[PDB]
Amino acid sequence: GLVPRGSHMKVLVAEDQSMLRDAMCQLLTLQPDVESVLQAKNGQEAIQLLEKESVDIAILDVEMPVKTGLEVLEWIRSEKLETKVVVVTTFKRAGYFERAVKAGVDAYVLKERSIADLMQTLHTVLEGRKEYSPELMEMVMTRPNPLTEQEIAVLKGIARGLSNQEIADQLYLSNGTIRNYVTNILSKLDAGNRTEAANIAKESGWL
Amino acid sequence: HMKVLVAEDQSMLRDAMCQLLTLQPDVESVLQAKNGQEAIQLLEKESVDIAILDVEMPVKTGLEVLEWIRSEKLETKVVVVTTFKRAGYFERAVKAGVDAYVLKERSIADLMQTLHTVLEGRKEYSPELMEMVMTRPNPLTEQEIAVLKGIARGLSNQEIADQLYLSNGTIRNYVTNILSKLDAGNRTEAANIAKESGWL
Numbered sequence: 001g002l003v004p005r006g007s008h009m010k011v012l013v014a015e016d017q018s019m020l021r022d023a024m025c026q027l028l029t030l031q032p033d034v035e036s037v038l039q040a041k042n043g044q045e046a047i048q049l050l051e052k053e054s055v056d057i058a059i060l061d062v063e064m065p066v067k068t069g070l071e072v073l074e075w076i077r078s079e080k081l082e083t084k085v086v087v088v089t090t091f092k093r094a095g096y097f098e099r100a101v102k103a104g105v106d107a108y109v110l111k112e113r114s115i116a117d118l119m120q121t122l123h124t125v126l127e128g129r130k131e132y133s134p135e136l137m138e139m140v141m142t143r144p145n146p147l148t149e150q151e152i153a154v155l156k157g158i159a160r161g162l163s164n165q166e167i168a169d170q171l172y173l174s175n176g177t178i179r180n181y182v183t184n185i186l187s188k189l190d191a192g193n194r195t196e197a198a199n200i201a202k203e204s205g206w207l
Numbered sequence: 208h209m210k211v212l213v214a215e216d217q218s219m220l221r222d223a224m225c226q227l228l229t230l231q232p233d234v235e236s237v238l239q240a241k242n243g244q245e246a247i248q249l250l251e252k253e254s255v256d257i258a259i260l261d262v263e264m265p266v267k268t269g270l271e272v273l274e275w276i277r278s279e280k281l282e283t284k285v286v287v288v289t290t291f292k293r294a295g296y297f298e299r300a301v302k303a304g305v306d307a308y309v310l311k312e313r314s315i316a317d318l319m320q321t322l323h324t325v326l327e328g329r330k331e332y333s334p335e336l337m338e339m340v341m342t343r344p345n346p347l348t349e350q351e352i353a354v355l356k357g358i359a360r361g362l363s364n365q366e367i368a369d370q371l372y373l374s375n376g377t378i379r380n381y382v383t384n385i386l387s388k389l390d391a392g393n394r395t396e397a398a399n400i401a402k403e404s405g406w407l
C-alpha cells in the first residue's frame with residue numbers, strides 16, 4: 001500500500017475546534033514533507049472537498065457537526081478513493097475505534113499525541129502501514145469473562161471427559177438444558193467442538 | 208519581546224499552540240504547562256509577560272491560576288482560552304481581573320492580536336459571552352411595569368390604584384418592591400430607570 005509521495009503529501013484536515021484546526025494546518029503546511037493542506041470544519045465540508053479534489057491523506061476528527069469523521073471515513077471507502085485515513089480524536093471510546101477499524105481506517109490516534117507523533121502517523125500510513133492507539137488496543141483486547149456460572153460448571157464438566165448426560169446429572173439439569181449451554185458456549189468462544197471450547201476457556205483463564 | 212506561558216491539558220493543542228507562538232516574530236519564548244499546578248510552579252521561578260490559560264485542567268484550573276497570579280501581584284497579563292461557554296467561568300474570570308477571555312472558536316491570528324491588545328493595557332472579552340451575560344429577562348412583573356408606566360405619566364398612587372382596580376395599599380407595596388428591585392430612591396427615579404433600561 002505504499003504511496004511514494006511522502007516528500008510532498010497532499011492532506012486534508014477535518015476538525016471542528018477552530019483554534020486546533022488552524023494551529024494543526026499551519027504547522028503541517030510548514031513541514032518539508034507536506035505540499036498542501038485542505039481544511040474542513042465539519043464532515044459535510046470534508047466530503048464536499050473530497051468530491052472536487054484528490055488528497056493522499058484525510059485526517060479526521062470524530063465529533064463534528066453534520067457528519068462525523070467516522071461517517072466521512074465510511075464515505076471515502078465507499079467511494080474507493082486512493083486516500084489513507086487517520087482519525088484524530090479526544091475520545092477513548094472502544095466503539096468508535098471498532099467502527100473505524102471495520103471501515104479499514106489506517107490510523108486511529110488520541111489528541112494526547114503530539115504534532116510529531118502525528119507526522120510520524122502520516123508517514124506510517126502513507127508507506128502502507130497501520131497505527132492504532134495502543135491505549136485503545138489494550139482497552140479492546142481485554143474482555144470480561146463471557147461465561148455464566150452455569151456454563152463455567154458445564155465446561156469444568158467437559159474438561160473431565162464427561163458426557164452431556166453426566167453433566168446434566170451433576171448439575172441437576174436436563175440433558176436438553178446442557179445441550180443448549182454447550183451450543184451457547186461454542187458461540188461465545190468461537191470453538192468448533194466441545195473439547196475445543198474447554199481448552200480455550202482454560203487457556204483464557206475463565207474456569 | 209513577548210515572554211509567554213501556555214497552560215493547556217490537551218497535548219496536541221498545547222504542542223501546536225506552543226510551536227506556533229514560538230514561531231511568531233514578537234514572541235521571544237514560550238513556557239509550557241499541561242496543568243495549573245505546573246503553570247504556578249513555572250510562574251514562581253520565571254518571569255512572564257503573558258500567561259495564556261485553559262480553564263479545565265487537572266489539579267488547578269486556569270481560573271485558580273489566574274487568582275494566584277493576581278494575589279501574588281505578578282506583572283503578568285492573563286488571557287484565558289477555553290472551549291467552554293459557561294457564564295460562571297467568564298464572570299469569575301472578569302471578577303478576578305482577567306485581561307482577555309476568548310473561545311477556542313477563535314483563530315491563532317485572533318489570539319496573537321489579543322496578546323498585543325492586553326500588553327497595551329486594553330481588555331478583550333469574548334463578544335459572544337458578553338452578549339450572553341448582558342442578556343437578562345425583564346426584572347419587572349407585568350404589574351410592576353403597569354405601575355411604572357403610570358408613574359411616568361405623572362399619576363399619583365391613588366390614580367394608579369383606580370386605573371388598575373387595586374387598593375392604593377397594593378400600589379404602595381408595588382412601589383416599595385420596585386424601589387428595592389431597581390435601587391431607586393423614589394418613584395419618579397424608578398420610572399426613569401425602568402424606561403431607559405428598556406423595561407417599559
Ligand code: BEF
Binds near residue numbers: 061089090111
Ligand atoms: F471532536 Be473529537 F476530538 F472527535
Ligand code: BEF
Binds near residue numbers: 261262263288311
Ligand atoms: F479545557 Be477547556 F478549554 F477550559
Ligand SMILES: [Mg+2]
Binds near residue numbers: 064
Ligand atoms: Mg470535534
Ligand SMILES: [Mg+2]
Binds near residue numbers: 215217261262263264
Ligand atoms: Mg482543558
